[PDB]
Write a protein that binds this ligand. Structure first.
Ligand SMILES: Nc1nc2c(ncn2[C@@H]2O[C@H](CO)[C@@H](O)[C@H]2O)c(=O)[nH]1
Length: 296
């Protein structure tokens, strides 16, 4: 992961947008991929921490441009773009800022009940429209096939951990993968466009109207299992919990809720493995150490 001063951020934009004068810079936020900077208190600029992050930034810019007026909520609108180099697919992107604060579980549970329920209904309508966006014109590259991903994760873990685990420990790893791959329910779904990081940090809230006023952070968006967009909201202290998501599910007219629960239960066991892989692919080593300790 690399880093920026405000000076570098300024000169970068100046190169490509010399007519855009900058008055104020502050850090808005940071994900796994980019630092986000708030320019003119009315524009969010994302600069990539590494080549992987930049590839995700490029994804996000491209998908946003295809869905920009298809959804019932505000999403980030692309106003400025950087350029490709040998290191980054896209050096930066600037977006219109969405005013609001994250809909944290704490905030959500302090709302009046009718507001909490409007939030579930508004999140369901958003998912329902997102999952219906026609995907013909999307890059076949964005398809994430879960069965494929799981087979590739199995090889990656073997090859990462082969000198770190004892043979009986790796055999149990292989058994875990095998059991997952024999269960069809994880792999039979109809691909559609999914947000794929759909959780409280990315759901913006207007505390004067007590209503959701935006969805942000489309860097992980893919064509994949729509159920991903529910399971990411379900974890208890950290996210919303099953009662709230079951309201979303009902508005969405989900027909197979026990399948969503079973996917969530498996994603919960799967976390240690993702920590190891995401660890290395993002070079965050504290995650790697953690998943490995867990696996033992
Ligand atoms: N309030 C607000 N924060 C944003 C916006 N875009 C990015 N961020 C913050 O910067 C982080 C990384 O994108 C986000 O998770 C938010 O915390 C935005 O449009 N409005």
């Amino acid at each position: 992961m690399r880093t920026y001063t405000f000076d570098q951020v300024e000169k970068a934009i100046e190169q490509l947008y010399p007519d855009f004068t900058i008055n104020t810079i502050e850090i808005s936020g940071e994900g796994n991929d980019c630092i986000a900077y708030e320019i003119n208190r009315d524009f969010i600029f994302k600069f990539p921490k590494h080549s992987r992050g930049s590839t995700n930034l490029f994804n996000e810019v491209n998908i946003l441009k295809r869905i920009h007026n298809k959804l019932p909520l505000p999403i980030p609108e692309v106003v400025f773009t950087g350029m490709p180099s040998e290191t980054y697919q896209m050096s930066f992107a600037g977006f219109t800022k969405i005013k609001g604060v994250p809909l944290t579980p704490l905030l959500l549970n302090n709302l009046p009940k009718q507001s909490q329920n409007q939030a579930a209904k508004d999140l369901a309508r958003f998912l329902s429209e997102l999952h219906s966006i026609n995907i013909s014109g999307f890059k076949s590259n964005l398809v994430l096939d879960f069965r494929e991903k799981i087979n590739e994760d199995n090889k990656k873990i073997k090859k990462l951990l082969s000198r770190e685990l004892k043979g009986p420990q790796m055999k149990k790893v292989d058994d875990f993968y095998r059991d997952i791959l024999e269960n069809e329910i994880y792999f039979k779904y109809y691909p559609c466009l999914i947000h794929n990081d759909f959780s409280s940090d990315h759901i913006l809230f207007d505390t004067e109207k007590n209503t959701i006023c935006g969805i942000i952070d489309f860097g992980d968006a893919a064509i994949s299992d729509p159920d991903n967009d529910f399971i990411s909201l379900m974890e208890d202290d950290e996210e919303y919990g099953m009662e709230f998501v079951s309201k979303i599910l009902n508005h969405y007219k989900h027909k197979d809720i026990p399948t969503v629960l079973e996917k969530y239960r498996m994603k919960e066991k799967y976390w240690s493995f993702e920590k190891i892989i995401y660890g290395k692919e993002y070079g965050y080593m504290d995650w790697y150490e953690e998943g490995l300790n867990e696996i033992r």
